[PDB]
Design a protein around this ligand. Sequence first.
Ligand SMILES: [K+]
Ligand SMILES: [K+]
Ligand SMILES: [K+]
Ligand SMILES: [K+]
Ligand SMILES: [K+]
Ligand SMILES: [K+]
Ligand SMILES: [K+]
Ligand SMILES: [K+]
Ligand SMILES: [K+]
Ligand SMILES: [K+]
Ligand SMILES: [K+]
Ligand SMILES: [Mg+2]
Ligand SMILES: [Mg+2]
Ligand SMILES: [Mg+2]
Ligand SMILES: [Mg+2]
Ligand SMILES: [Mg+2]
Ligand SMILES: [Mg+2]
Ligand SMILES: [Mg+2]
Ligand SMILES: [Mg+2]
Ligand SMILES: [Mg+2]
Ligand SMILES: [Mg+2]
Ligand SMILES: [Mg+2]
Ligand SMILES: [Mg+2]
Ligand SMILES: [Mg+2]
Ligand SMILES: [Mg+2]
Ligand SMILES: [Mg+2]
Ligand SMILES: [Mg+2]
Ligand SMILES: [Mg+2]
Ligand SMILES: [Mg+2]
Ligand SMILES: [Mg+2]
Ligand SMILES: [Mg+2]
Ligand SMILES: [Mg+2]
Ligand SMILES: [Mg+2]
Ligand SMILES: [Mg+2]
Ligand SMILES: [Mg+2]
Ligand SMILES: [Mg+2]
Ligand SMILES: [Mg+2]
Ligand SMILES: [Mg+2]
Ligand SMILES: [Mg+2]
Ligand SMILES: [Mg+2]
Lengths: 184, 147, 261
Amino acid sequence: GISRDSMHKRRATGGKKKSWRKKRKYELGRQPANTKISSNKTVRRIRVRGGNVKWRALRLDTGNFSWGSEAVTRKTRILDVVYNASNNELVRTQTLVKSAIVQVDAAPFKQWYLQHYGIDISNHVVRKIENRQADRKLDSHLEEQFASGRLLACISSRPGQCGRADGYILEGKELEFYMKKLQK
Amino acid sequence: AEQTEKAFLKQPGVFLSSKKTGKGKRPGKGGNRYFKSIGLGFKTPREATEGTYIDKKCPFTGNVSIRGRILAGTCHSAKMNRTIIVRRNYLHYVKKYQRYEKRHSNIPAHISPCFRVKEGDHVTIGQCRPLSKTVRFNVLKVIPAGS
Amino acid sequence: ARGLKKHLKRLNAPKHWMLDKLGGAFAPKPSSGPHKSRECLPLVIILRNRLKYALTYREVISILMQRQVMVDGKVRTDKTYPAGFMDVVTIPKTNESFRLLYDTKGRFRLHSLRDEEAKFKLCKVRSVQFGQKGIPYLNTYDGRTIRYPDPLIKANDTIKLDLDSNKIVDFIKFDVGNVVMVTGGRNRGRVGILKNREKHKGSFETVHIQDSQGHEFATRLGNVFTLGKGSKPWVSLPKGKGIKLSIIEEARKRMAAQSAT
RNA sequence: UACCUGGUUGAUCCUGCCAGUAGUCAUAUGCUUGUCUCAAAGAUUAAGCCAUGCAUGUGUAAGUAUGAACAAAUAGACUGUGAAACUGCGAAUGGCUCAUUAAAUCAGUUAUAGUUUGUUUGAUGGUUACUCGGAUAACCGUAGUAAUUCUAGAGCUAAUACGUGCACCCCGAAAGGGAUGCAUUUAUUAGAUAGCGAUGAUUCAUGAUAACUCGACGGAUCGCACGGCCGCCGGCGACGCAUCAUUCAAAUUUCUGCCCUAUCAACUUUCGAUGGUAGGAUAGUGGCCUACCAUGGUGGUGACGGGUGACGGAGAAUUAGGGUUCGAUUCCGGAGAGGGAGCCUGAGAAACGGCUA
RNA sequence: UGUUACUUUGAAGAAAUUAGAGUGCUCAAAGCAAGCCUACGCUCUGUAUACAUUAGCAUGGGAUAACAUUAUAGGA
RNA sequence: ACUCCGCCGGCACCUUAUGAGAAAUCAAAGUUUUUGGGUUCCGGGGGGAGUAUGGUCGCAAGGCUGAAACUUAAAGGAA
RNA sequence: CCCGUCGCUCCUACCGAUUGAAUGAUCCGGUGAAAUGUUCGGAUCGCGGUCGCGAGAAGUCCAUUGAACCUUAUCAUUUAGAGGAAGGAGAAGUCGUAACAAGGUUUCCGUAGGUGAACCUGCGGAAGGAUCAUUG
Ligand SMILES: [K+]
Ligand SMILES: [K+]
Ligand SMILES: [K+]
Ligand SMILES: [K+]
Ligand SMILES: [K+]
Ligand SMILES: [K+]
Ligand SMILES: [K+]
Ligand SMILES: [K+]
Ligand SMILES: [K+]
Ligand SMILES: [K+]
Ligand SMILES: [K+]
Ligand SMILES: [Mg+2]
Ligand SMILES: [Mg+2]
Ligand SMILES: [Mg+2]
Ligand SMILES: [Mg+2]
Ligand SMILES: [Mg+2]
Ligand SMILES: [Mg+2]
Ligand SMILES: [Mg+2]
Ligand SMILES: [Mg+2]
Ligand SMILES: [Mg+2]
Ligand SMILES: [Mg+2]
Ligand SMILES: [Mg+2]
Ligand SMILES: [Mg+2]
Ligand SMILES: [Mg+2]
Ligand SMILES: [Mg+2]
Ligand SMILES: [Mg+2]
Ligand SMILES: [Mg+2]
Ligand SMILES: [Mg+2]
Ligand SMILES: [Mg+2]
Ligand SMILES: [Mg+2]
Ligand SMILES: [Mg+2]
Ligand SMILES: [Mg+2]
Ligand SMILES: [Mg+2]
Ligand SMILES: [Mg+2]
Ligand SMILES: [Mg+2]
Ligand SMILES: [Mg+2]
Ligand SMILES: [Mg+2]
Ligand SMILES: [Mg+2]
Ligand SMILES: [Mg+2]
Ligand SMILES: [Mg+2]
């Protein structure tokens, strides 16, 4: 099957390598997951070397995404793949791979923001909410996309390896970089 | 800027969007640029501690450790991107004739942007994990030719 | 091979076992255990080749399956159990108790012990690090793991382990001036005072040891085992006391023995 | 034993080879052969083809007995032995051979801070339950086929088989609630200094926090012994699950080193050649693979190609010294099982006394 | 702190083979045994040691030799 | 211009062996079993044969590079 | 003593029309088993309240790995060949006499032309010459 050996490669000088042994099981590869965004979740269990387990996600719809500046992580629905640095064909096929830029539902984070800062984007409770409002700062670029209900996010997990699609909300100069790539 | 690829390049684990400031924190914390000492008596160049380049294969700011053999040689080719060919000259002993013959070996090595190198310069390379099909070494020091 | 080798050819067995080359095609393959297969003495060798209690491979099994042999205070029934340096072997029926120590020629010697001295052993500390829940632990070179060790214990130190309480009674820091034994290499079995430690960044650390008679020899840190603080070891040594004699000196003793004996 | 002798001339001194002399753990063959010890033996040509038999099975007091089994006894679940069968484990070692293979294998020397590892050993696993459910083998009895440890249907009944299941932080009218084992995945945070561990060197070991997963995890198991409290409590073992360390190992890997040939001088790169970035895959590193980008990489210090009646080494023969030749074969490493390819099971195989083409 | 070769010593290094110590298998090729006295045994019985290119690792030496370097000193 | 003494460089010659060599002979062809200043080319019994073949150069003639099968007990040097 | 053609026998090799032949290997292309992943499919079984839930075979779809066969091409090794032609060996063939003496034209090198054959001739060169020698 798929093999990760170097025997089929050319030498650094350019000469060929004559085969001196058959393929080994301990140097195999496997078919890519090609995880897609779909509400029909499907993750198949793969037995790997040592009797260990890998989770190969064929279809996913939700992910665990973290708002780094706010230090809050929420499970949210994945809406769309918008950018992929490796292959633009993975964008129109809606493939979920590590480091792909996706849009996630902003609703779970809005609820936390309202519950935490008391703002939309009980005597002892109002005492602390206003206290936390003193040091409240929200990026203009990050707030502008709360109106549409979608947040740009980057997948930080490997769905074909762990079976999950987790990530973090884009912000700072990383958000500026990617939103300029989408400005066409 | 250093952002020239299709993806956004950054150091892993360095959070750049923190409300607090990084003033008074160690490298790689508070959004501060991350760098480290490789040991073995080698100095961290000022160009790596105060630079803005992103190189995950850099020995001082990347994610590669130096362990194994430390070798020296002369820069033979500096035409690849962040990779050079190091020529190592040595003598092979011919037993029957009790004499020597000159031999050489070309060792590919990764060079981080913090180093400036030209053909003929003397370089020291430290072994690291495989970085490509042929590269197993990282440049640790460059001495300009004629110095 | 497609997996693990289960056989040991007799000529490939460690030389310090002193197995005759024509005794058979195979040697006992040491089982997995606290000591490495090249630095151990399987119980079958001890019971049959060293002590002569068993005459054959079969008889060693009979002795062990009666639960008559203990290693480090616990009964062992595995014929190829890897008993190694500082291990205490006890045979209650014969009232015997031995400690595995190297003689000055590098071979394991069954050093008879007193009942009082057979209640502990020395172990070399491999490393100290935090485990799960931030609980510190140390592991030794005989496969043991001790949780909540004294914070002063560091790598390469020696700990005195009580075989009853299974706790660290006392420890010796690794430092120049202590008496050590060599546990590997050319100088295996030699005892001396650690005189110097030469560190080489990225490379092996060399230790210079001086014998009681002024003979100085070097070796790697991994082959050193501290036996006591200062100059007195905490364990009983064999007759040679780690003093390696020249072949000329050894021949001199043999000649004198024939004149007297 | 640091050795030479015959042969060119009518004769001489040379160059020079032919021939002789001796050995070979060196093969064959010829003739001959009483005794003791020791001992190689279908490698060379055909990794050509194979009749027949055998070379891998396995039972402890301790997983499962209602044989319509045996033995010894005599209103009891069973509890003497135990075929068969299920379950578990092993069959990846060993043995054989040298076909392919020329910086490859391999040797010495490294590295894994680049990974996996049944087992052994050590340590470590939170503050209907007086015990759940449905199947199936052996057995039993209807069979099919020329036929195979080829095969269908029916009736029974077990488990350590199979499937289940008791088992600090946030919100907040400080009540109440949420989360709260271990593992999994991501993000934020601490990991100082010269309370606070290690390295030549790691945002490392490890901690805290926010969530996440539709988690083969966290004992519905067995033997022996009976005791101590007034139903309660309790001994020594067996087997099994998970985590770390250890051991047994592998995989990949650093440096240097290989015979003849130039009547082999350029080779590599569209379809990976050299490197870069981002992914995918893998136990994990890596053009290992994909997308995009750059134009590199090797070479008279012999690349590339060709030859080998080439597996490599430890070693063997002969050796004043230097050297020449050999190394299929019992030790180590590799490789293969008529030729290729593919794969299941499993801790471990691209397995062949396993399967598929 | 210019970089090397060379040399010295040491560490690490499979066994078997080779060299070699001990030992009267009757000798020998071998083998790794045995020996001592006569008790309920002893000699802690023995099963040494050297060699092991080249490359790599680490100390001492600095003659010989290689490369690098020098005056608008970016000198001490 | 010629005569005499000398120095450096050159083409040579003559005598001689304390040298070398199989000798002829050589002041280098010496300083070599008491064997080593540096470096290039090149030979390994006689033939087959500078032939066949391949490559390369040339308008051609040919040049450069260059085998094997097989054959033979000598061929050859000096005296 | 000795050279070559010619003539006879045998041995080795070479050239050679045959778009020679055989065998083996490799490249590209074509076709493509099987397996695996994916898509669809839902025989059948079980479990709940004649609708749900779970499991799921055959088959099918795309992709991957990829044996195998069939081309053209190239290379390797072996081999046939009318005829041409080389070398060597084979007691005692034919024709001359070219080399050895100043060998009867001194011999030899390079080159060119010519002749049955060795060889001859032209041009330049060498002594390994038959001259170390004419201040006559
Ligand atoms: K293997
Ligand atoms: K198995
Ligand atoms: K090696
Ligand atoms: K080799
Ligand atoms: K990888
Ligand atoms: K890459
Ligand atoms: K298994
Ligand atoms: K003159
Ligand atoms: K003439
Ligand atoms: K003449
Ligand atoms: K003429
Ligand atoms: Mg095997
Ligand atoms: Mg290290
Ligand atoms: Mg000789
Ligand atoms: Mg004669
Ligand atoms: Mg001869
Ligand atoms: Mg007799
Ligand atoms: Mg069974
Ligand atoms: Mg080759
Ligand atoms: Mg190599
Ligand atoms: Mg960490
Ligand atoms: Mg990558
Ligand atoms: Mg590509
Ligand atoms: Mg060979
Ligand atoms: Mg072969
Ligand atoms: Mg061999
Ligand atoms: Mg062979
Ligand atoms: Mg054989
Ligand atoms: Mg073998
Ligand atoms: Mg195999
Ligand atoms: Mg066969
Ligand atoms: Mg197979
Ligand atoms: Mg077979
Ligand atoms: Mg087999
Ligand atoms: Mg003269
Ligand atoms: Mg000479
Ligand atoms: Mg000749
Ligand atoms: Mg004439
Ligand atoms: Mg005439
Ligand atoms: Mg004439």
